[PDB]
CSV table of C-alpha atoms and ligand atoms in Angstrom, one decimal:
chain,number,residue,atom,x,y,z
A,2,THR,CA,-23.6,-12.7,-1.3
A,3,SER,CA,-21.1,-15.4,-2.3
A,4,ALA,CA,-19.6,-18.2,-0.3
A,5,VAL,CA,-16.4,-16.4,0.0
A,6,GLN,CA,-18.1,-13.2,1.1
A,7,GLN,CA,-20.0,-15.2,3.8
A,8,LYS,CA,-16.7,-16.6,5.2
A,9,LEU,CA,-15.2,-13.1,5.2
A,10,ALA,CA,-18.3,-11.9,7.1
A,11,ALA,CA,-17.8,-14.7,9.7
A,12,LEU,CA,-14.2,-13.7,10.1
A,13,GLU,CA,-15.1,-10.1,10.6
A,14,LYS,CA,-17.8,-10.9,13.1
A,15,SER,CA,-15.3,-12.9,15.2
A,16,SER,CA,-12.6,-10.2,14.9
A,17,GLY,CA,-14.6,-7.4,16.6
A,18,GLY,CA,-13.5,-4.8,13.9
A,19,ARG,CA,-14.3,-3.8,10.4
A,20,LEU,CA,-12.8,-5.7,7.4
A,21,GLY,CA,-12.4,-4.5,3.8
A,22,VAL,CA,-11.3,-6.8,1.0
A,23,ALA,CA,-10.9,-6.4,-2.8
A,24,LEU,CA,-9.5,-9.2,-5.0
A,25,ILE,CA,-9.0,-8.9,-8.8
A,26,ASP,CA,-8.2,-12.2,-10.5
A,27,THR,CA,-6.3,-11.3,-13.7
A,28,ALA,CA,-7.1,-14.8,-15.1
A,29,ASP,CA,-10.5,-13.5,-16.0
A,30,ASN,CA,-10.7,-9.9,-14.6
A,31,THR,CA,-13.3,-11.1,-12.0
A,32,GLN,CA,-13.5,-9.5,-8.6
A,33,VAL,CA,-14.5,-10.4,-5.1
A,34,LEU,CA,-15.4,-7.5,-2.7
A,35,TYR,CA,-16.2,-7.2,1.0
A,36,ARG,CA,-17.1,-3.7,2.1
A,37,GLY,CA,-15.3,-2.8,-1.2
A,38,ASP,CA,-16.8,0.7,-1.5
A,39,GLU,CA,-16.3,1.7,2.2
A,40,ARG,CA,-13.5,4.0,3.1
A,41,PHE,CA,-10.6,2.8,5.3
A,42,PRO,CA,-7.5,4.7,6.6
A,43,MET,CA,-4.6,3.7,4.3
A,44,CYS,CA,-1.8,4.2,6.7
A,45,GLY,CA,1.5,2.9,5.2
A,46,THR,CA,-0.2,1.4,2.2
A,47,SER,CA,-0.3,5.0,0.8
A,48,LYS,CA,3.5,4.7,0.4
A,49,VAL,CA,2.9,2.8,-2.8
A,50,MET,CA,1.1,5.7,-4.4
A,51,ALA,CA,3.9,8.2,-3.4
A,52,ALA,CA,6.7,5.9,-4.7
A,53,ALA,CA,4.8,5.3,-7.9
A,54,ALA,CA,4.2,9.1,-8.4
A,55,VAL,CA,8.0,9.7,-8.1
A,56,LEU,CA,8.6,6.8,-10.5
A,57,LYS,CA,6.2,8.6,-13.0
A,58,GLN,CA,8.2,11.8,-12.6
A,59,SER,CA,11.4,9.8,-13.3
A,60,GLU,CA,10.1,8.9,-16.7
A,61,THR,CA,10.9,12.4,-18.0
A,62,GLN,CA,13.9,13.0,-15.6
A,63,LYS,CA,16.5,10.1,-16.1
A,64,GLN,CA,18.5,11.4,-13.1
A,65,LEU,CA,15.7,12.1,-10.7
A,66,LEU,CA,16.1,8.9,-8.7
A,67,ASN,CA,19.8,9.8,-8.2
A,68,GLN,CA,19.0,13.2,-6.7
A,69,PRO,CA,20.4,13.6,-3.2
A,70,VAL,CA,17.9,14.7,-0.6
A,71,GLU,CA,19.2,16.3,2.6
A,72,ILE,CA,18.2,14.4,5.8
A,73,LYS,CA,18.3,16.8,8.8
A,74,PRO,CA,18.0,15.8,12.5
A,75,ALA,CA,14.6,17.6,12.6
A,76,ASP,CA,13.3,15.5,9.7
A,77,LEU,CA,13.2,12.3,11.8
A,78,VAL,CA,9.8,11.3,12.9
A,79,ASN,CA,8.4,8.3,14.8
A,80,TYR,CA,9.8,5.4,12.7
A,81,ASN,CA,12.9,5.9,10.6
A,82,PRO,CA,15.1,2.8,10.5
A,83,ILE,CA,16.9,3.8,7.4
A,84,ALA,CA,16.8,7.6,7.5
A,85,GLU,CA,18.4,7.7,11.0
A,86,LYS,CA,21.6,6.4,9.5
A,87,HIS,CA,21.8,9.3,7.1
A,88,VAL,CA,21.1,12.3,9.3
A,89,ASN,CA,23.3,15.3,8.3
A,90,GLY,CA,23.9,13.5,5.1
A,91,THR,CA,21.7,12.6,2.1
A,92,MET,CA,19.7,9.8,0.5
A,93,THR,CA,18.7,9.6,-3.2
A,94,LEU,CA,15.1,9.5,-4.2
A,95,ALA,CA,15.7,5.8,-5.2
A,96,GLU,CA,17.0,5.2,-1.7
A,97,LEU,CA,14.0,7.0,-0.2
A,98,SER,CA,11.6,5.0,-2.3
A,99,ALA,CA,13.2,1.7,-1.3
A,100,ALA,CA,13.2,2.7,2.4
A,101,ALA,CA,9.6,3.9,2.3
A,102,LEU,CA,8.4,0.7,0.6
A,103,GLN,CA,10.6,-2.0,2.0
A,104,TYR,CA,11.0,-0.8,5.6
A,105,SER,CA,8.0,1.6,5.9
A,106,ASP,CA,10.4,4.4,6.8
A,107,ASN,CA,8.3,7.5,7.7
A,108,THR,CA,11.0,10.1,7.1
A,109,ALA,CA,11.6,8.6,3.7
A,110,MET,CA,7.8,8.8,2.9
A,111,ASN,CA,7.9,12.5,3.9
A,112,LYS,CA,10.7,13.2,1.4
A,113,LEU,CA,8.6,11.5,-1.4
A,114,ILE,CA,5.6,13.6,-0.4
A,115,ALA,CA,7.8,16.8,-0.4
A,116,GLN,CA,9.2,15.9,-3.9
A,117,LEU,CA,5.5,15.7,-5.1
A,118,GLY,CA,4.6,19.1,-3.7
A,119,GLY,CA,2.8,17.9,-0.6
A,120,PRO,CA,0.0,15.3,0.1
A,121,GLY,CA,-2.1,16.9,-2.7
A,122,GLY,CA,0.6,16.0,-5.2
A,123,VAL,CA,0.2,12.3,-4.4
A,124,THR,CA,-3.6,12.7,-4.8
A,125,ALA,CA,-3.0,14.4,-8.1
A,126,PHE,CA,-1.1,11.5,-9.4
A,127,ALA,CA,-3.8,9.1,-8.3
A,128,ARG,CA,-6.4,11.2,-10.3
A,129,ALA,CA,-4.1,11.2,-13.3
A,130,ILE,CA,-4.1,7.4,-13.4
A,131,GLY,CA,-7.9,7.2,-13.0
A,132,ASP,CA,-8.2,6.7,-9.2
A,133,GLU,CA,-11.0,9.1,-8.2
A,134,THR,CA,-11.2,7.7,-4.6
A,135,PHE,CA,-7.7,7.9,-3.1
A,136,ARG,CA,-6.9,10.9,-1.0
A,137,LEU,CA,-3.8,11.8,0.9
A,138,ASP,CA,-4.2,14.9,3.1
A,139,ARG,CA,-1.4,14.7,5.6
A,140,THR,CA,2.3,13.9,6.0
A,141,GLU,CA,3.8,11.2,8.3
A,142,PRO,CA,3.1,10.4,11.1
A,143,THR,CA,-0.3,12.1,11.3
A,144,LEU,CA,-1.7,10.4,8.2
A,145,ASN,CA,-1.9,7.3,10.5
A,146,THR,CA,-4.4,8.7,13.1
A,147,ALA,CA,-7.0,6.4,11.4
A,148,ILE,CA,-10.0,8.0,13.3
A,149,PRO,CA,-13.3,6.3,12.5
A,150,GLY,CA,-15.4,8.5,10.1
A,151,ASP,CA,-12.4,10.7,9.2
A,152,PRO,CA,-12.1,10.9,5.4
A,153,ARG,CA,-8.5,12.1,5.5
A,154,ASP,CA,-5.9,9.7,4.1
A,155,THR,CA,-8.4,7.1,3.0
A,156,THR,CA,-9.4,5.0,0.1
A,157,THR,CA,-11.7,2.1,-0.7
A,158,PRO,CA,-10.6,-1.5,-1.2
A,159,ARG,CA,-12.1,-1.5,-4.8
A,160,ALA,CA,-10.2,1.6,-5.7
A,161,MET,CA,-6.9,0.5,-4.3
A,162,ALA,CA,-7.0,-2.9,-5.9
A,163,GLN,CA,-7.7,-1.4,-9.4
A,164,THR,CA,-4.9,1.1,-8.9
A,165,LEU,CA,-2.4,-1.5,-7.7
A,166,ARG,CA,-3.3,-3.6,-10.7
A,167,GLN,CA,-2.6,-0.7,-13.1
A,168,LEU,CA,0.6,0.2,-11.4
A,169,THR,CA,2.2,-3.3,-11.1
A,170,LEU,CA,0.6,-5.3,-14.1
A,171,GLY,CA,-0.7,-2.5,-16.4
A,172,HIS,CA,0.6,0.6,-18.1
A,173,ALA,CA,0.1,3.4,-15.5
A,174,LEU,CA,4.0,3.5,-15.4
A,175,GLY,CA,6.6,3.0,-18.1
A,176,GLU,CA,7.9,-0.6,-18.4
A,177,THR,CA,11.2,0.1,-16.6
A,178,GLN,CA,9.3,2.0,-13.8
A,179,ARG,CA,6.7,-0.8,-13.4
A,180,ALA,CA,9.5,-3.4,-13.1
A,181,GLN,CA,11.2,-1.2,-10.4
A,182,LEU,CA,8.1,-0.9,-8.4
A,183,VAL,CA,7.4,-4.7,-8.6
A,184,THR,CA,11.0,-5.4,-7.6
A,185,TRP,CA,10.7,-3.1,-4.6
A,186,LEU,CA,7.4,-4.7,-3.5
A,187,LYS,CA,8.8,-8.2,-3.8
A,188,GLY,CA,11.6,-7.1,-1.5
A,189,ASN,CA,9.3,-5.9,1.2
A,190,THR,CA,10.6,-6.9,4.7
A,191,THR,CA,7.4,-6.3,6.7
A,192,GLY,CA,4.8,-8.6,5.1
A,193,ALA,CA,5.3,-12.2,6.2
A,194,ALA,CA,2.6,-12.1,8.9
A,195,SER,CA,-0.1,-10.4,6.7
A,196,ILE,CA,-1.6,-11.4,3.4
A,197,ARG,CA,1.4,-13.7,2.7
A,198,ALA,CA,0.8,-15.7,5.8
A,199,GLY,CA,-2.5,-16.8,4.3
A,200,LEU,CA,-1.1,-18.0,1.0
A,201,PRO,CA,0.5,-21.3,0.1
A,202,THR,CA,4.3,-21.1,0.4
A,203,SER,CA,4.8,-21.8,-3.3
A,204,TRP,CA,3.0,-18.6,-4.3
A,205,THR,CA,5.2,-15.5,-4.7
A,206,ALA,CA,4.1,-11.9,-4.0
A,207,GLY,CA,5.0,-8.3,-3.4
A,208,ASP,CA,3.2,-6.2,-0.8
A,209,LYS,CA,3.0,-3.1,1.3
A,210,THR,CA,1.7,-3.2,4.8
A,211,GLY,CA,0.2,-0.4,6.9
A,212,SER,CA,-0.5,0.1,10.6
A,213,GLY,CA,-2.0,3.0,12.6
A,214,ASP,CA,-4.1,3.9,15.6
A,215,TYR,CA,-7.5,2.1,16.1
A,216,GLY,CA,-5.6,-1.1,15.6
A,217,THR,CA,-5.6,-0.3,11.9
A,218,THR,CA,-3.8,-3.2,10.1
A,219,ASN,CA,-3.5,-3.2,6.3
A,220,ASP,CA,-1.8,-4.9,3.4
A,221,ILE,CA,-2.0,-4.6,-0.4
A,222,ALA,CA,-0.4,-7.2,-2.6
A,223,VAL,CA,0.3,-8.4,-6.1
A,224,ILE,CA,0.4,-12.2,-6.1
A,225,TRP,CA,1.7,-14.9,-8.5
A,226,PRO,CA,0.0,-18.1,-7.5
A,227,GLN,CA,1.4,-21.4,-8.6
A,228,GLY,CA,0.3,-22.1,-12.2
A,229,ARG,CA,-2.1,-19.1,-12.2
A,230,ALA,CA,-2.3,-15.6,-13.6
A,231,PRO,CA,-1.5,-13.0,-11.0
A,232,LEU,CA,-4.0,-11.7,-8.4
A,233,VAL,CA,-4.2,-8.3,-6.8
A,234,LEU,CA,-5.5,-8.3,-3.2
A,235,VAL,CA,-6.2,-5.5,-0.8
A,236,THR,CA,-7.1,-6.3,2.9
A,237,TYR,CA,-7.9,-3.4,5.2
A,238,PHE,CA,-8.8,-3.7,8.9
A,239,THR,CA,-9.7,-1.2,11.6
A,240,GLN,CA,-11.1,-1.4,15.1
A,241,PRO,CA,-13.3,0.7,17.4
A,242,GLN,CA,-10.8,1.6,20.2
A,243,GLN,CA,-7.9,4.0,19.6
A,244,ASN,CA,-5.4,1.7,21.5
A,245,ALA,CA,-6.5,-1.5,19.8
A,246,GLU,CA,-3.8,-4.1,19.1
A,247,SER,CA,-2.5,-4.9,15.6
A,248,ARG,CA,-4.3,-7.9,13.9
A,249,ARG,CA,-2.1,-9.1,11.1
A,250,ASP,CA,-3.6,-12.5,11.7
A,251,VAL,CA,-7.0,-11.2,10.5
A,252,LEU,CA,-5.4,-10.2,7.2
A,253,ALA,CA,-3.8,-13.6,6.9
A,254,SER,CA,-7.2,-15.2,7.5
A,255,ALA,CA,-8.8,-13.1,4.8
A,256,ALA,CA,-6.1,-14.0,2.4
A,257,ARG,CA,-6.5,-17.7,3.2
A,258,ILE,CA,-10.3,-17.5,2.5
A,259,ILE,CA,-9.6,-15.8,-0.8
A,260,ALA,CA,-6.9,-18.4,-1.8
A,261,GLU,CA,-9.1,-21.4,-0.9
A,262,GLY,CA,-12.0,-19.8,-2.9
A,263,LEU,CA,-10.0,-19.9,-6.1
B,301,LIG,C1,6.0,-0.7,10.3
B,301,LIG,C2,4.6,-0.3,10.7
B,301,LIG,C3,4.0,-1.4,11.7
B,301,LIG,S1,4.6,1.3,11.6
B,301,LIG,C4,4.6,2.2,10.1
B,301,LIG,C5,3.5,3.3,9.8
B,301,LIG,N1,2.6,3.6,10.9
B,301,LIG,C6,3.0,4.4,11.8
B,301,LIG,O1,4.1,4.9,11.9
B,301,LIG,C7,1.9,4.9,12.8
B,301,LIG,C8,1.4,3.9,13.8
B,301,LIG,C9,0.4,4.3,14.8
B,301,LIG,C10,0.0,3.3,15.7
B,301,LIG,C11,0.4,2.0,15.6
B,301,LIG,C12,1.3,1.6,14.7
B,301,LIG,C13,1.8,2.6,13.8
B,301,LIG,C14,2.9,2.3,8.8
B,301,LIG,O2,1.8,2.2,8.3
B,301,LIG,N2,3.8,1.4,9.2
B,301,LIG,C15,3.6,0.0,9.5
B,301,LIG,C16,3.8,-1.0,8.3
B,301,LIG,O3,4.4,-0.6,7.3
B,301,LIG,O4,3.3,-2.1,8.4
B,302,LIG,C1,15.6,20.7,-1.1
B,302,LIG,C2,15.8,19.8,-2.4
B,302,LIG,C3,14.7,20.1,-3.4
B,302,LIG,S1,17.4,20.1,-3.2
B,302,LIG,C4,18.1,18.5,-3.1
B,302,LIG,C5,18.1,17.6,-4.4
B,302,LIG,N1,17.9,18.4,-5.6
B,302,LIG,C6,18.6,18.1,-6.7
B,302,LIG,O1,19.3,17.2,-6.8
B,302,LIG,C7,18.3,19.1,-7.9
B,302,LIG,C8,17.6,20.3,-7.4
B,302,LIG,C9,18.4,21.4,-7.0
B,302,LIG,C10,17.9,22.6,-6.5
B,302,LIG,C11,16.5,22.7,-6.5
B,302,LIG,C12,15.7,21.6,-6.9
B,302,LIG,C13,16.3,20.5,-7.3
B,302,LIG,C14,16.9,17.0,-3.8
B,302,LIG,O2,16.0,16.3,-4.3
B,302,LIG,N2,16.9,17.8,-2.7
B,302,LIG,C15,15.8,18.3,-2.0
B,302,LIG,C16,16.0,18.2,-0.5
B,302,LIG,O3,17.2,18.2,-0.1
B,302,LIG,O4,15.1,18.3,0.3
B,303,LIG,C1,-3.1,1.1,-19.7
B,303,LIG,C2,-4.6,0.8,-19.4
B,303,LIG,C3,-5.5,2.0,-19.8
B,303,LIG,S1,-5.1,-0.6,-20.3
B,303,LIG,C4,-5.5,-1.7,-19.0
B,303,LIG,C5,-7.0,-1.9,-18.6
B,303,LIG,N1,-7.9,-1.7,-19.7
B,303,LIG,C6,-8.2,-2.7,-20.6
B,303,LIG,O1,-7.7,-3.8,-20.4
B,303,LIG,C7,-9.1,-2.4,-21.8
B,303,LIG,C8,-9.3,-3.7,-22.5
B,303,LIG,C9,-10.6,-4.3,-22.6
B,303,LIG,C10,-10.8,-5.5,-23.3
B,303,LIG,C11,-9.7,-6.1,-23.9
B,303,LIG,C12,-8.5,-5.6,-23.9
B,303,LIG,C13,-8.3,-4.4,-23.2
B,303,LIG,C14,-6.8,-0.9,-17.6
B,303,LIG,O2,-7.6,-0.2,-17.0
B,303,LIG,N2,-5.6,-0.7,-18.0
B,303,LIG,C15,-4.9,0.5,-18.0
B,303,LIG,C16,-3.5,0.2,-17.4
B,303,LIG,O3,-3.0,-0.9,-17.7
B,303,LIG,O4,-2.9,1.0,-16.7
B,304,LIG,C1,-2.7,-13.7,-18.7
B,304,LIG,C2,-1.9,-12.4,-18.9
B,304,LIG,C3,-1.4,-12.3,-20.3
B,304,LIG,S1,-3.0,-11.0,-18.4
B,304,LIG,C4,-2.7,-11.1,-16.7
B,304,LIG,C5,-2.1,-9.8,-16.0
B,304,LIG,N1,-2.2,-8.6,-16.8
B,304,LIG,C6,-2.9,-7.6,-16.4
B,304,LIG,O1,-3.6,-7.6,-15.4
B,304,LIG,C7,-2.9,-6.3,-17.3
B,304,LIG,C8,-4.0,-5.3,-16.8
B,304,LIG,C9,-3.6,-4.3,-15.9
B,304,LIG,C10,-4.6,-3.4,-15.5
B,304,LIG,C11,-5.9,-3.5,-16.0
B,304,LIG,C12,-6.2,-4.5,-16.8
B,304,LIG,C13,-5.3,-5.4,-17.3
B,304,LIG,C14,-0.8,-10.5,-16.2
B,304,LIG,O2,0.3,-10.1,-16.0
B,304,LIG,N2,-1.3,-11.5,-16.8
B,304,LIG,C15,-0.8,-12.3,-17.8
B,304,LIG,C16,-0.3,-13.7,-17.4
B,304,LIG,O3,-0.6,-14.1,-16.3
B,304,LIG,O4,0.2,-14.5,-18.3
């Protein structure tokens, strides 16, 4: 138990919920874990794996990202800020990837999942890049039920941090695809209250948030601290009551503890 792990435990104790953290510091490859091997519901953070899998497919199909996908009225689900504008029209796979990542559009995520052959296709890509933990079992919006003890649509902080590192800083994707993914993450619109609220302003980052039932509040990020090699940070948080409120502040607090511990 490290000093940082002790502060994370204190934060968790005061939060009432269950906190999972995984940091990889690429300056030396060291890691900091808190419940790093416990499973948590991914919710929207799973959108990174789906977009990355489509990017992988695009490496052998130069026109894939320009394929027009039909958006029908019935395709709309619970949260579709971008897709709703294109009902009875089409969106390209690039448009669907950007909407899923940067706006957390659920209809867009469902189109990425369908392009991959269903939730199992997203899981297959994860296995192909060495992630033996990740599992996607359902489409949107049910993949966000986040029921405690339910293994569906979960991963561990350790696994997600390693995967995010390989996707954004490593060679799991071709260079062009890696750059596209990083560009999309850096352009996220939903993350200012989460991990990034706990980092010094000078630091830059890309992230993908997630939210679900049980007050599930998640964020995964790739960070470029001022004058330091990048970090990869995963912060997952879930609560005992189905109707619990979101706690993005708890993710900010975890990130702050990690940053001050550097
Ligand atoms: C924008 C959101 C807050 S909502 C969207 C998706 N989750 C859901 O659609 C399900 C949900 C269930 C209960 C409470 C919030 C969201 C998901 O995850 N999303 C969040 C995000 O990207 O941070
Ligand atoms: C149903 C589809 C697979 S077809 C349309 C678009 N597909 C293409 O651009 C090439 C293609 C044509 C026929 C069958 C598969 C792929 C694309 O992607 N679309 C999918 C959709 O609308 O849901
Ligand atoms: C492409 C890779 C297989 S290589 C990189 C990392 N593996 C290593 O860094 C192995 C290594 C050990 C010591 C010195 C240099 C490289 C790791 O895992 N990475 C994968 C990735 O980037 O997606
Ligand atoms: C110091 C570096 C040359 S290495 C560090 C990071 N690169 C990686 O994390 C590559 C990698 C990906 C997956 C697994 C292992 C290594 C990255 O980018 N970093 C460079 C930097 O900050 O200048």
